[PDB]
Amino acid sequence: SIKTPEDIEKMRVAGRLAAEVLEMIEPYVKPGVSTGELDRICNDYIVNEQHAVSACLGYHGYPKSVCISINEVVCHGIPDDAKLLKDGDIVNIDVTVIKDGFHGDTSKMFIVGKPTIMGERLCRITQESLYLALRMVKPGINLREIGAAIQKFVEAEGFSVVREYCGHGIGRGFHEEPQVLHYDSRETNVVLKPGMTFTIEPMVNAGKKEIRTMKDGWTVKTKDRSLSAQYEHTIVVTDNGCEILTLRKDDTIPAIISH
């Protein structure tokens, strides 16, 4: 569907709130803190300050408000009061809030304590793959091209792209069409049109692409247990490019990308 100007404004508000949760939580992401408390802090902020609601809580049965994945955990890490961040960890906090019926979806990586070379690199490269994808977004381009570009860049680094998960259209629904693959697929055939709103959220493994789901029915780790990183932004396709709806102060890319 092509969001109307009214819907797009609502997406701007929802996206801003999602981004601000990530900005707000940053100071708390330090050695010693539990992912459980981080989740509590995020939920209180969303509910009490943003007067919004986490879209993840209860989604497909998801138990928490935000997803927090550490190191080898690829995605859907479940916040837990007994899981503490430690020096060297790379942590993804993925937020999705619903405000006035619309969803804002975004995640970023946080480096805890003293960063490790592989960690800094995996995170920087993963974000750059998101960035290069964003710089390609504009009417007429096919999503297949974007997924192809992300994969090419990532694999050039000797990393791999997780295939089981993808970006997605977003709006009044958390996950709407189309699917936004972060790799080249002969199944992908979607030409971008202005007004389309979707996410780009590549999951990149330092090692092999294969994954493993744990036994809590949610946590996903790399099969080989290598590090995995992810960054995500919600965007709206504009007439000559796109507008990042979930941009943060620490983002090193413009909100409005012109072509």
Ligand SMILES: O=C(O)c1ccc(-c2cc(Cl)ccc2Cl)o1
């Ligand atoms: O960024 C996302 O699109 C995202 C993060 C977590 C999820 C999710 C996806 C499914 Cl299918 C079920 C439950 C959850 Cl929390 O989706």
Ligand SMILES: [Mn+2]
């Ligand atoms: Mn997300």
Ligand SMILES: [Mn+2]
């Ligand atoms: Mn998403």
Ligand code: NA
């Ligand atoms: Na990870």
